[PDB]
């Protein structure tokens, strides 16, 4: 409990590590701002080494030294009373090559990754003739893939009845051992609600979700 890194401190009390493999002034707990899980929410995703590079002094290291090699640990926790209910799905997929709305085009950069701001899913299709937009129908998970099969990646269940938090540890997964961090996002974090949030009247109408990221062994 109450681990420390640099000048930040997060308190805790399970863990799931990578594919069985265990992975200096930047090693601090960067914490993105929280999203609000409502009743009829859809899902969120962040591209991983882009949401950091816009903001912190880790991003100040990014413009100086482009090419690097990193390893991540990810804390995800949401806080609610006993009286709510629902079930999330935290999965850290590598090399998420999403598909465009229009069939002949490719999605542009501004839709592909909100820098430290969560892009959202939806539960319908999208129109195609407009511009470069990501095909963001949730029940094919954006990749043309059946969503129920997504647990082949390192995943972790959050079930509001018993469990409350989630921790992920992801080692460096790439073909070439050194690449530029501007044109290649190796990891992708997803949060999908399967059993939707429900509550009776008088409770709070939303459950906030915080995600806390920390790099480990960042070389350049």
């Amino acid at each position: 409990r109450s681990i420390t890194l640099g000048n930040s401190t997060i308190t805790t009390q399970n863990v799931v590590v990578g594919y069985g493999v265990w992975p200096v002034a930047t090693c601090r707990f960067y914490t993105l701002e929280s999203v609000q899980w409502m009743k009829n929410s859809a899902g969120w995703w962040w591209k991983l080494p882009d949401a950091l590079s816009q903001m912190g002094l880790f991003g100040q290291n990014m413009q100086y030294h482009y090419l690097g090699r990193t390893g991540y640990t990810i804390h995800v926790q949401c806080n609610a009373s006993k009286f709510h209910q629902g079930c999330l799905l935290v999965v850290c997929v590598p090399e998420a090559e999403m598909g465009c709305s229009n069939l002949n085009n490719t999605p542009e950069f501004s839709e592909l990754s909100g820098g430290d701001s969560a892009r959202m899913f939806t539960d319908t299709q999208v129109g195609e003739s407009n511009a470069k937009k990501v095909q963001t129908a949730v029940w094919n998970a954006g990749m043309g893939v059946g969503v129920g099969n997504l647990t082949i990646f390192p995943h972790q269940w959050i079930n509001l009845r018993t469990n409350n938090s989630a921790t992920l540890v992801m080692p460096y997964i790439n073909s070439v051992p050194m690449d530029n961090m501007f044109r290649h996002n190796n990891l992708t974090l997803m949060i999908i609600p399967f059993v939707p949030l429900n509550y009776s009247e008088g409770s709070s109408p939303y459950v906030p979700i915080t995600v806390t990221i920390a790099p480990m062994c960042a070389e350049y």
Partner: antibody
Amino acid sequence: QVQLKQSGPGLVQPSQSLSITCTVSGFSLTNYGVHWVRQSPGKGLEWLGVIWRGGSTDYNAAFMSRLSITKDNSKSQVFFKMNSLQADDTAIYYCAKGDYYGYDAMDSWGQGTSVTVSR
Amino acid sequence: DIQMTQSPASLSVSVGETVTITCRASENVYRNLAWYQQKQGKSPQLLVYAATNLADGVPSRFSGSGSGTQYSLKINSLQSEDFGSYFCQHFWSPVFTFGAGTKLELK
């Protein structure tokens, strides 16, 4: 959070050009796209055009040549130029933000600027 | 092109009944519908997006249903402020079109 506001001419001359500057607040421009929607008493509601959050633009079919919508990121202002300003454009004009939780729907709007064309 | 037909034109009911309103499209929209309400001399506001998902500030009295082309909205109990206009709008593809616009006298 304070929403967006706007300011227009209010009175023009017929067969001219127009410029409304809509000022946003509370949100960035890389996450939301603004919508230009004309509320009219005669034709009702009608949508003109959208610049997306990536800078690419869209237009209505019947207004392909007389519009030019653009924005700035840091100054957080959007500009669009209605042109040729004919006698059927006597309507109030709205600035409105989009992308309500990623759904392409108008979340909040401006205050509305009423314009007329004639003397 | 895609068109929306709002029906009926206008209603005049008392306060507190279960009233309904529909609008039909021309082709499929895949539930990409948004309903709007504007009173006299103000901006419109969004109530239901994606034809069933209600907004944040809207009460639970409003509900919308439908799939494909036939879509509808339901107000189970009207109040004093529940008059004003009502508009439905698709957002499938540019060009986005709107509905006609209904009105409530609340006699």
